[PDB]
Amino acid sequence: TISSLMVPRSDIVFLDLNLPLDANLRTVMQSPHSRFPVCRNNVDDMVGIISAKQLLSESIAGERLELVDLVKNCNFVPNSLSGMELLEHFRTTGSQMVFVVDEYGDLKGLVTLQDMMDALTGEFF
Numbered sequence: 001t002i003s004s005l006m007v008p009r010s011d012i013v014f015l016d017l018n019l020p021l022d023a024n025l026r027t028v029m030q031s032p033h034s035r036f037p038v039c040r041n042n043v044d045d046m047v048g049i050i051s052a053k054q055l056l057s058e059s060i061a062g063e064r065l066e067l068v069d070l071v072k073n074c075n076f077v078p079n080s081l082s083g084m085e086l087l088e089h090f091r092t093t094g095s096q097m098v099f100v101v102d103e104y105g106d107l108k109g110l111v112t113l114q115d116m117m118d119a120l121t122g123e124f125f
């Protein structure tokens with residue numbers, strides 16, 4: 001049932017290392033999200049994740065900025081994980097965001113800690 005807590009791949013807002021820095025800046029400016037998955041060309045070539053605050057901080061800073069330098073590591077998990085197993089993966093890793101793949105290794109979506117906590121403290125379970 002981990003699919004229902006998922007942000008589907010079509011709803012993922014992401015940055016593209018193959019695009020100009022300015023286009024990614026605009027993507028970030030037009031979204032409320034704190035963190036963005038970063039890929040190359042498309043979401044099936046995910047390279048990691050970027051903090052918006054950092055990107056913008058270091059942009060407003062005016063320092064020589066290359067997007068690839070702010071990328072942080074991203075964890076993948078199978079879509080076959082149970083709710084508990086997913087929860088424990090979050091606690092163990094301390095990750096805010098994890099990527100979910102199907103049996104072909106293809107990206108199905110992402111899960112956030114935030115969404116995981118909302119589901120625990122609401123009426124989900």
Ligand SMILES: Nc1ncnc2c1ncn2[C@@H]1O[C@H](COP(=O)(O)O)[C@@H](O)[C@H]1O
Binds near residue numbers: 007034115
């Ligand atoms: N980069 C993103 N793309 C799509 N949805 C996201 C992204 N970041 C966060 N979300 C969703 O928005 C919620 C709030 O995240 P935030 O907007 O960063 O406070 C998360 O729990 C996810 O449901």
